[PDB]
Curated annotation (Swiss-Prot), chain B:
Name this protein carries in UniProt: DNA-directed RNA polymerase subunit beta
PTM comment, free text: Acetylated on several lysine residues in the presence of glucose.
Assembly notes: The RNAP catalytic core consists of 2 alpha, 1 beta, 1 beta' and 1 omega subunit. When a sigma factor is associated with the core the holoenzyme is formed, which can initiate transcription. The rRNA transcription and antitermination complex (rrnTAC) consists of RNAP, NusA, NusB, NusE (rpsJ), NusG, SubB, ribosomal protein S4, DNA and precursor rRNA; S4 is more flexible than other subunits. In pull-down experiments interacts with CedA.
Covered residues, full protein: 349 to 398 of 1342
Family: Belongs to the RNA polymerase beta chain family.
Function of the molecule: DNA-dependent RNA polymerase (RNAP) catalyzes the transcription of DNA into RNA using the four ribonucleoside triphosphates as substrates. Resistance to the antibiotics salinamide A, salinamide B, rifampicin, streptolydigin, CBR703, myxopyronin, and lipiarmycin can result from mutations in this protein.
Taxonomic placement: Bacteria, Pseudomonadati, Pseudomonadota, Gammaproteobacteria, Enterobacterales
Organism: Escherichia coli (strain K12)
Top-level taxon: Bacteria
TM region(s), chain numbering: none
Biotechnology remark: Co-administration of salinamide and rifampicin or salinamide and myxopyronin suppresses the emergence of resistance to both antibiotics.
From Swiss-Prot, chain C:
Post-translational modification: Acetylated on several lysine residues in the presence of glucose.
Biotechnology: Co-administration of salinamide and rifampicin or salinamide and myxopyronin suppresses the emergence of resistance to both antibiotics.
The organism's place on the tree of life at top rank: Bacteria
Family (UniProt): Belongs to the RNA polymerase beta chain family.
Subunit organization: The RNAP catalytic core consists of 2 alpha, 1 beta, 1 beta' and 1 omega subunit. When a sigma factor is associated with the core the holoenzyme is formed, which can initiate transcription. The rRNA transcription and antitermination complex (rrnTAC) consists of RNAP, NusA, NusB, NusE (rpsJ), NusG, SubB, ribosomal protein S4, DNA and precursor rRNA; S4 is more flexible than other subunits. In pull-down experiments interacts with CedA. (Microbial infection) Interacts (via flap domain) with Escherichia phage lambda antitermination protein Q; this interaction renders bacterial RNAP resistant to transcription pausing and allows it to read through termination signals.
Name of the protein in its database record: DNA-directed RNA polymerase subunit beta
Species the sequence originates in: Escherichia coli (strain K12)
Curated annotation (Swiss-Prot), chain D:
Family from the record: Belongs to the RNA polymerase beta' chain family.
A GO MF label: magnesium ion binding
Outcome after substituting G767 to A/C: Resistant to antibiotics salinamide A and B
Sites where the protein binds Mg(2+): D445, D447, D449
Protein name: DNA-directed RNA polymerase subunit beta'
Post-translational modification: Acetylated on several lysine residues in the presence of glucose.
Positions that bind Zn(2+) 2: C799, C873, C880, C883
Keyword Amino-acid biosynthesis in record: no
Binding site for Zn(2+) 1: C55, C57, C70, C73
Organism: Escherichia coli (strain K12)
Swiss-Prot record, chain G:
Protein name: DNA-directed RNA polymerase subunit omega
General function of this protein: Promotes RNA polymerase (RNAP) assembly. Latches the N- and C-terminal regions of the beta' subunit thereby facilitating its interaction with the beta and alpha subunits. Part of the processive rRNA transcription and antitermination complex (rrnTAC). The complex forms an RNA-chaperone ring around the RNA exit tunnel of RNAP. It supports rapid transcription and antitermination of rRNA operons, cotranscriptional rRNA folding, and annealing of distal rRNA regions to allow correct ribosome biogenesis.
Assembly description: The RNAP catalytic core consists of 2 alpha, 1 beta, 1 beta' and 1 omega subunit. When a sigma factor is associated with the core the holoenzyme is formed, which can initiate transcription. The rRNA transcription and antitermination complex (rrnTAC) consists of RNAP, NusA, NusB, NusE (rpsJ), NusG, SubB, ribosomal protein S4, DNA and precursor rRNA; S4 is more flexible than other subunits.
Organism annotation: Escherichia coli (strain K12)
Top-level taxonomy: Bacteria, Pseudomonadati, Pseudomonadota, Gammaproteobacteria, Enterobacterales
Top-rank lineage group of the source organism: Bacteria
UniProt family annotation: Belongs to the RNA polymerase subunit omega family.
Length: 49, 50, 50, 1338, 90, 99, 73
């Protein structure tokens, strides 16, 4: 994971039950950006026509 | 008590009873029953106690 | 960076996160005193001591 | 269109009428041209074309030819979906018996032929012959003849002899039968067969024959001669990728049947030996039975795998069958799910919806609105515009969404608040935003939960969403009228911090001109939020006919309370925000607003409360640190002291002075005391602080410690959890349920060592494994309770009855745990509530008791009100609105068309994963009052209990009971009725053992029949040598004395025999066995003297389930089956005998009281029906019979509310009475009277009730009956609809029973209209059904 | 008799174990399928096979009485066989 | 995941299930009970027939929606037609009685 | 929008009956072609029908009388 600077306090209901409030500097610096690779296939078959 | 409630007096009757219990309805036979009992355990092929 | 809710700690008696937060603050404090000595171009003798 | 679904057996003519052709070949399709074969199971000339509007040869390919039969192949040219509807048939070579009507346990074929199943099967599998109308040659009809017997009987009998074998023999038996003549013979026999078993059998069989005659069927239809074939598209042969094919298992079964039928037909033409044809017929029978119902009598049939093949019966029954799964649990269009986030800025009626999820859900609406404004010329153009996501599309979407609710639903829908309607607000992102105040309704948190969203399409659906399901209409819990929209945890913390004073803060002692100045001072930093000041407050009150009169005064309050006053609406007082405002104060405040002002003010107020709480909770900057968990300074000292005490106990035990069992408890108690001491020290060190000051002196105040602030406000957590944080973890358990003696003396601020952690792991996993069981068991109860109560609906306004339950507060020994207000609020009075002075009517009648009336009743201090109950409603097939009460979710009297049964089931069931399977000392002050009390002056003038139902109640000054203590029999009370008492004033005492024997007058006593060594024994005290004659039981005493009954009749000094004082009968008090007669033989005694001294529930969800299932307790208490005088007779007959010879009535009633029992009635005593004889758990069925219906409902509601009250759950009693109403809805008839019912018969109570009421209006008399009590399972089993019953019962049993009876279904329940796909007759669809009934009567 | 004894407990506990059933089972040799037939016959009045020792009653008495009568017949039976191949061999 | 209309199953012509299939949401008994606890009888009817497996009542609904006419002609579910055919393919004769 | 429908329920007297009358009126207004008896403040026909019901301008009898008049003409 990543080392995040964290403060424990309510802050306006945006962490009400278990919600988390994050800064835009965490999103700018790409701290939790991940790379996902997927493969797609195209099969050409011989039909009756 | 087990002996007094024993329905057997000889080995052959015991083997016949075991034969009926395992595969009931088949004609019991001395050789067949002895073979079945001797193969159920005591046979290296059909029973392994590792 | 992130704001967490304190009300989740009392009911869920997992107070290892508070101790982890305190110790992480301590470790990052040690790290910030070296960044300063390495940015004020100070001699090894002083970095070796701290 | 259709108004009923009729079911019956099918004749071969009907089966041929359905079919469009006969299947003759087991072929399916060609293996190269994958086209349908000529006469196979996928033919096209029988089941229809495989392409729309085309033949198979190809000549006719254009619709212009629709409706002609091509002569190159005979394939009618039409739609291919007709292939989904057409049936075929197979002509069987031999008749075959239907497995359902042959192997259903009552075995309709056997029941109709009066023939045991084994004989039928033998004749069926060619094992023996049978005689079919043997005639006049010594033959008996239905006589079994073995093959050799048939051969030898055929000799010397040139007559046909009418013998046959196989299913054709059974068909001949059924066909030759005559039902009317059988009915005539059965009536003639019942004329002169008055024998219990015999006449019972005759009545059963004549009933069955009459039912079959009425049904319109013919018995010979139970034997199959033609076999229907399902349409191909329901058993398809779909091609897959790669050339593979997928097929339904029915094709295999059909191919089996066809192959064996063809082989049999071919083999009949070769004149094969009869062994071969018999074996072929047996195989054909097996194949047909495997088709209809696979593995019902044989073992099974398997395909390529070893799995059994799925048969026709397997496609309807099961938990996956159509009669279940698809028909109420299907997939739906215009829906989607996602993850939920908070969105704290929203209003209660609005939800945040992702723009991308909405561009898909509302696609047709967008196309329509684009084409209507000219943006898109056609629909394909619109489809490309939305696909490109043009700019105008977003504006059109914002227009479409404007006022169009969406239903949001979270996984386990446990009650109806799990689906609610909201107005969307289009947002960015991919997560749904949910208003915080709604979370409690959904039981939802924001750690990964997901919600589903549906969109209503029709105008009616949108209106129902807006008017019935909108979140702002549902702010009260349907289980109890309490608000369900209360602020939860962070709002509570913020509002608690705001309204909270402290000793010395900035701006103390100031005087403000109002709330505005208070807010102006705080935001400018000139005053603290906790600053005791004086503020000029203006408050309005409706102290008139709705006027809102204003009052201005100078209140003493903090700054925060004055600021918070700005959001409170007008009509409320100022004392609501003039406190610390914890968790429950806020709920009380919302309830007050709702009850005083209404619904819209409450919604606005709740939103304002949420906003203010969030703002000021952010402002406080509250946090949690490690120094906030303060450990007591004396913890180690307490632990050392407890360790020393346990060591001393252990070393004493090692010296053998205390047994191990006792020392275990000693150590347990020592550690419990230590844990309590530590917790008290911690909580006292944590909950207070010292602050200095206004002048400079110490002062104590409530602490501002963050953990204590969270716990005290109710925001989150409790003292139990703080105990494990700062105190000691406490005492654990063991897998065996035992308590480990040594506790975990460490807390989490410290660490647990490895051993303590290993101990804790067991508890954790145990809890994790339990929760799941609780969930699975609460679902079972809810399903069963909605099955029983689903079709209960409010169908009337006022039945006009004058009866009801008598509500009084419930008191368990000491204090009152539920006042009268909670039990009587919202109900309708059955009788006038006379003022306690008996002067005039306080509430006339038929008055819904809302809050004002309940306040008036509290003012008059009346504690007994008779209210109308559902269980005692005169309405037929429904309930009236006045007998129900009020809605509890809307706050007003209920409306016609309300599914009160589903609401009751859900309200009882939803709070069930929170239920865990677990002398008198007048405390207060009042005038003791006694009930059912008989007594006589004792030696010191003290009273003596001479009643078995004696009751003592500490009636208070106003006359309202505050305690109720059952008075043990044979005990003396120090005080008396009217004698004021005090604390600890033990009003009376009694032997904790040995039931005493008292007399009535002072006189000598003769031991008549009390012979020593014969009926009694000289057990004179061995040490003190004090006479101790002991009565000997039959076996204990001599055989001669065994018949003799020991008697101690009182005798006067005159030598006469004293007769029971006040009675002609002599004062004999026969003593039973073991009677401790310490009194000397023939000794004079005092009044009511001790003539002798005879020697001495589950909980949780399983308790509730077995309370609704009417289970009889294992040691059922015995009661007085009749009023009269008790006695006895032929004893030792395994069970002692009793009798209650009615004072004047006959039939003294005899009973087999098991001897091991301990009676509570002296052999000579009078009793009343419903009086305890033995003692123990009471049986609900006994209570209903001896005592009325009102006395069994009161028992169940009180017995089932104890489980819930103990756990803190709160649900109204309305919901338990509607379930009870459904339990006792069958009545047993006692006297046929002038009605048309037999005596020993069970009928619907609502049916017998109206049959005799109509009869009574005529010149006849009614039929008496006795009510019956059933559990929620049998009661359900009695549904009069084979479609509703086939849903939740055994489908095979339901459909065979309905078919032979020729039953007909008329859709009028909620479960049968859901399956058929039409409006339910409950809610908005209750008016449709009523007009349908009007037109039908027309 | 033996079957009645087996029923005695079934009802007394409301459930039984495979072993107890198989044992109380009439010595009447059964060709597997027959044992299969009786198990359901007992299941007719309702019972829990449960290879191990242990959820409500919904059985009509009519089913119950019929299952009882057929259960009695099983004991009086001699060579009842519900298997075509076996019947063929005989 | 969101769906408006998509592909349908072969035998039970019901919305397919999943995201790949772009399926719909499962609406089961406990949700039916919730709608019955309200009076929402039209919502239930449209969720059982027009939105799931009323084959010719679901295309008419689409055409009506794209015409600005929010009204449905429900009809009969195809889970009931299949049930009738399966019961009738036994020996039983179950028929809809004329009004 | 219209957060609550308390007043319309008060006028009609039954909640299920309010849902039916409002739907009938809204269908008259959207597809039949009719003019609102109240100003249409950018509201959908559902809300317009509800707030006509709120003011006593529409109920089952009124709808029925008007429809019978139309049938006559
Ligand atoms: Mg969760
Ligand atoms: Zn052709
Ligand atoms: Zn009533």
């Amino acid at each position: 994971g990543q080392n995040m600077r964290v403060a424990f306090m309510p802050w306006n209901g945006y962490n009400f039950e278990d919600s988390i409030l994050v800064s835009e500097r965490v999103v700018q610096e790409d701290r939790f950006t991940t790379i996902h690779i997927q493969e797609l296939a195209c099969v050409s078959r011989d039909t009756k026509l | 008590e087990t002996l007094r409630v024993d329905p057997t007096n000889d080995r052959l009757s015991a083997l016949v009873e075991i034969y009926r219990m395992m595969r009931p309805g088949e004609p019991p036979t001395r050789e067949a029953a002895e073979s079945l009992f001797e193969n159920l355990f005591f046979s290296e092929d059909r029973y392994d106690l590792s | 960076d992130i704001v967490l809710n304190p009300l989740g700690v009392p009911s869920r008696m997992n107070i290892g996160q508070i101790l982890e937060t305190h110790l992480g603050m301590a470790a990052k404090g040690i790290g910030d005193k070296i960044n300063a000595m390495l940015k004020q171009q100070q001699e090894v003798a002083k970095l070796r001591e701290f | 269109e259709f108004d009923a679904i009729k079911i019956a057996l099918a004749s071969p003519d009907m089966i041929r009428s359905w079919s469009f052709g006969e299947v003759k070949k087991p072929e399916t399709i060609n293996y190269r041209t994958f086209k349908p074969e000529r006469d196979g199971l996928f033919c096209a000339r029988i089941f229809g074309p495989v392409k729309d509007y085309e033949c198979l040869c190809g000549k006719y390919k254009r619709l212009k030819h629709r409706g002609v039969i091509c002569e190159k192949c005979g394939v009618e040219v039409t739609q291919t979906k007709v292939r989904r509807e057409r049936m075929g048939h197979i002509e069987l070579a031999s008749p075959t018996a239907h497995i359902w009507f042959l192997k259903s346990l009552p075995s309709r074929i056997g029941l109709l032929l009066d023939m045991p199943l084994r004989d039928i099967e033998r004749v069926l599998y060619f094992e023996s012959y049978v005689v079919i109308e043997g005639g006049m040659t010594n033959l008996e009809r239905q006589q079994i003849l073995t093959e050799e017997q048939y051969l030898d009987a055929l000799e010397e009998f040139g007559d046909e002899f009418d013998a046959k074998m196989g299913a054709e023999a059974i068909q001949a038996l059924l066909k030759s039968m005559d039902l009317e003549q059988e009915c005539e013979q059965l009536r003639e026999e019942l004329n002169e067969t008055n024998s219990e078993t015999k006449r019972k059998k005759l009545t059963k069989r004549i009933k069955l024959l009459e039912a079959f005659v009425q049904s319109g069927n013919k018995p010979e239809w139970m034997i199959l001669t033609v076999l229907p074939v399902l349409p191909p598209d329901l058993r398809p042969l779909v091609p897959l990728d790669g050339g593979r094919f997928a097929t339904s298992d029915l094709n295999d079964l059909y191919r089996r049947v066809i192959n064996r039928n063809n082989r049999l037909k071919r083999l009949l033409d070769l004149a094969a030996p009869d062994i071969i044809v018999r074996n072929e017929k047996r195989m054909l029978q097996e194949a047909v039975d495997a088709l209809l119902d696979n593995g019902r009598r044989g073992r099974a049939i398997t395909g390529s795998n070893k799995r059994p093949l799925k048969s026709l019966a397997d496609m309807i029954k099961g938990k996956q069958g159509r009669f279940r799964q698809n028909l109420l649990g299907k997939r739906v269009d215009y829906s989607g799910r996602s993850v939920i986030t908070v969105g704290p800025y929203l209003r209660l009626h609005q939800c945040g919806l992702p723009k991308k999820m909405a561009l898909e859900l509302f696609k047709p609406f967008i196309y329509g609105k684009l084409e209507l404004r000219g943006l898109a010329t056609t629909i394909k153009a619109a489809k490309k515009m939305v696909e490109r996501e043009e700019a105008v599309v977003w504006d059109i979407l914002d227009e479409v969404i404007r006022e169009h609710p969406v239903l949001l639903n979270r996984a386990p829908t446990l009650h109806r608040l799990g689906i609610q309607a909201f107005e969307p607000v289009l947002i960015e992102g991919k997560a749904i935003q949910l208003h915080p105040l709604v979370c409690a309704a959904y039981n939802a948190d924001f750690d990964g939960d997901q919600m589903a969203v549906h969109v209503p399409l029709t105008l009616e659906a949108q209106l129902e969403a807006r008017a019935l399901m909108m979140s702002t209409n549902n702010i009260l819990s349907p289980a109890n009228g309490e608000p369900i929209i209360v602020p939860s945890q962070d709002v509570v913390l913020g509002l608690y911090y705001m309204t909270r004073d402290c000793v010395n803060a900035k701006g103390e002692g100031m005087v403000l001109t109002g709330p505005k100045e208070a807010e102006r001072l705080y935001r400018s930093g000139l005053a603290s939020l906790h600053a005791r000041v004086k503020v000029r407050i203006t408050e309005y009150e409706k102290d008139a006919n709705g006027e809102l009169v204003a009052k201005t005064s100078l209140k003493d309050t903090t700054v925060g309370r004055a600021i918070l006053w700005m959001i409170v609406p007008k009509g409320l007082p100022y004392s609501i925000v003039n406190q610390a405002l914890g968790k429950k104060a806020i709920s009380k405040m919302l309830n007050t607003c709702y009850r005083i002002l209404g619904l819209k003010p409450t919604v606005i107020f709740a939103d304002q409360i949420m906003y203010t709480g969030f703002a000021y909770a952010a402002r406080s900057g509250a946090s949690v640190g490690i120094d906030d968990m303060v450990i007591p300074e004396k913890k180690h000292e307490i632990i050392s002291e407890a360790e020393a005490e346990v060591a001393e106990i252990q070393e004493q035990f090692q010296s053998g002075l205390v047994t191990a069992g006792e020392r275990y408890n000693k150590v347990i108690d020592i550690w419990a005391a230590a844990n309590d001491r530590v917790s008290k020290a911690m909580m006292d060190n944590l909950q207070t602080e010292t602050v200095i000051n206004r002048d400079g002196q110490e002062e104590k105040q409530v602490s501002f410690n963050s953990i204590y602030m969270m716990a005290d406000s109710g925001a989150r957590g409790s003292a139990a959890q703080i105990r494990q944080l700062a105190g000691m973890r406490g005492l654990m358990a063991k897998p065996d349920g035992s308590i480990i003696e040594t506790p975990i003396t460490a807390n989490f601020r410290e660490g647990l060592n490895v051993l303590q952690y290993f101990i804790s792991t067991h508890g954790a996993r145990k809890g994790l494994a339990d929760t799941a069981l609780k969930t699975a068991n609460s679902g079972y109860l809810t399903r069963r309770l909605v099955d029983v109560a689903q079709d209960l609906v409010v169908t009337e306004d006022d039945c006009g009855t004058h009866e009801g339950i008598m509500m009084t507060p419930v008191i368990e020994g000491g204090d009152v745990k539920e006042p009268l207000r909670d039990r009587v609020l919202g109900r309708v009075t059955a009788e006038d509530v006379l003022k306690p002075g008996t002067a005039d009517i306080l509430v006339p009648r038929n008055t819904l008791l809302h809050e004002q009336w309940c306040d008036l009743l509290e003012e008059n201090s009346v504690d007994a009100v008779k209210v109308r109950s559902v269980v005692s409603c005169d309405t037929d097939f429904g309930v009236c609105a006045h007998c129900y009460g009020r809605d509890l979710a809307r706050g007003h009297i209920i409306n016609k068309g309300e599914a009160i049964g589903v609401i009751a089931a859900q309200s009882i069931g939803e709070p069930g994963t929170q239920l865990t399977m677990r002398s008198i000392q007048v405390k207060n002050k009042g005038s003791i009052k006694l009930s059912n009390v008989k007594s006589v002056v004792n030696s010191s003038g003290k009273l003596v209990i001479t009643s078995r139902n004696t009751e003592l109640k500490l009636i208070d000054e106003f006359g309202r009971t505050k305690e109720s203590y059952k008075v043990p029999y044979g005990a003396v009370l120090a005080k008396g009725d009217g004698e004021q008492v005090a604390g600890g004033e033990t009003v009376a005492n009694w032997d904790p053992h040995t039931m005493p024997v008292i007399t009535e007058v002072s006189g000598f006593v003769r031991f008549t029949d009390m012979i020593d060594g014969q009926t009694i024994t000289r057990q004179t005290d061995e040490l003190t040598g004090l006479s101790s004659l002991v009565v000997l039981d039959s076996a204990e005493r001599t055989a001669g004395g065994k018949d003799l009954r020991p008697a101690l009749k009182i005798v006067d000094a005159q030598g006469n025999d004293v007769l029971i004082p006040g009675t002609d009968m002599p004062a004999q008090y026969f003593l039973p066995g073991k009677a401790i007669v310490q009194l000397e033989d023939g000794v004079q005694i005092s009044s009511g003297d001790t003539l002798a001294r005879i020697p001495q529930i589950t909980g949780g969800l399983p308790r509730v389930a077995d309370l609704f299932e009417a289970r009889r307790p294992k040691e059922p208490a015995i009661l007085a089956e009749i009023s009269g005088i008790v006695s006895f007779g032929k004893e030792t007959k395994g069970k002692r005998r009793l009798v209650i010879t009615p004072v004047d009535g006959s039939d003294p009633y005899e009973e087999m009281i098991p001897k091991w029992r301990q009676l509570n009635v002296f052999e000579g005593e009078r009793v009343e029906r419903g009086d305890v004889i033995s003692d123990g758990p009471e049986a609900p069925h006994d209570i209903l019979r001896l005592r009325g219906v009102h006395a069994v409902t009161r028992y169940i509601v009180n017995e089932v509310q104890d489980v819930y009250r103990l756990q803190g759950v709160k649900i109204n009693d309305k919901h338990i009475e509607v379930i009870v109403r459904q339990m006792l809805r069958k009545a047993t008839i006692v006297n046929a009277g002038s009605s048309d019912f037999l005596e020993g018969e069970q009928v619907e109570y609502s049916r017998v009730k109206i049959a005799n009421r109509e009869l009574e209006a005529n010149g006849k008399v009614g039929a008496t009956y006795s009510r019956d009590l059933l559990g929620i399972t049998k009661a359900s089993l009695a549904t009069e609809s084979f479609i509703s019953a086939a849903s939740f019962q055994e489908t095979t049993r339901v459909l065979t029973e309905a078919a032979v009876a020729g039953k007909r279904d008329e859709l009028r329940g909620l479960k049968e209209n859901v399956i058929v796909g039409r409006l339910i007759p409950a809610g908005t669809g209750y008016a449709y059904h009523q007009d349908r009934m009007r037109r039908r009567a027309a | 008799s033996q079957l009645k004894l087996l029923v005695t407990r079934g009802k007394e506990q409301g459930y039984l174990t495979y072993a107890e059933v198989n044992d109380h089972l009439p010595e009447d040799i059964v060709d597997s399928d027959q044992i299969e037939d009786i198990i359901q016959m007992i299941n007719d009045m309702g019972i829990q096979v449960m290879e191990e020792a242990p959820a409500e009653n919904t059985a009509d008495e009519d089913a119950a009485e019929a299952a009882a009568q057929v259960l009695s017949s099983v004991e009086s039976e001699i060579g009842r066989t519900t298997d075509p191949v076996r019947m063929y061999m005989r | 995941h969101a769906r408006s209309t998509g592909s349908y199953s072969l035998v039970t012509q019901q919305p397919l299930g999943g995201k790949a299939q772009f399926g719909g949401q499962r609406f089961g008994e406990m949700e039916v009970w919730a709608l019955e606890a309200y009076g929402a009888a039209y919502t239930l009817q449209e969720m059982l027939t027009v939105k799931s497996d009323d084959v010719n009542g679901r295309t008419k609904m689409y055409k009506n929606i794209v015409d600005g006419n929010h009204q449905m002609e429900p009809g009969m579910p195809e889970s009931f037609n299949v049930l009738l055919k399966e019961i009738r393919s036994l020996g039983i004769n179950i028929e809809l009685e004329d009004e | 929008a219209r957060v609550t429908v308390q007043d319309a329920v008060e006028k009609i007297g039954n909640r299920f009956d309010l849902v039916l009358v409002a739907a009938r009126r809204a269908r008259q207004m959207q597809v039949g072609g009719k003019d609102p008896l109240v100003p249409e403040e950018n509201d959908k026909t559902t809300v317009i029908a509800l707030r006509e019901i709120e003011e006593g301008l529409i109920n089952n009898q009124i709808l029925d009388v008007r429809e019978r008049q139309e049938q006559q003409e």
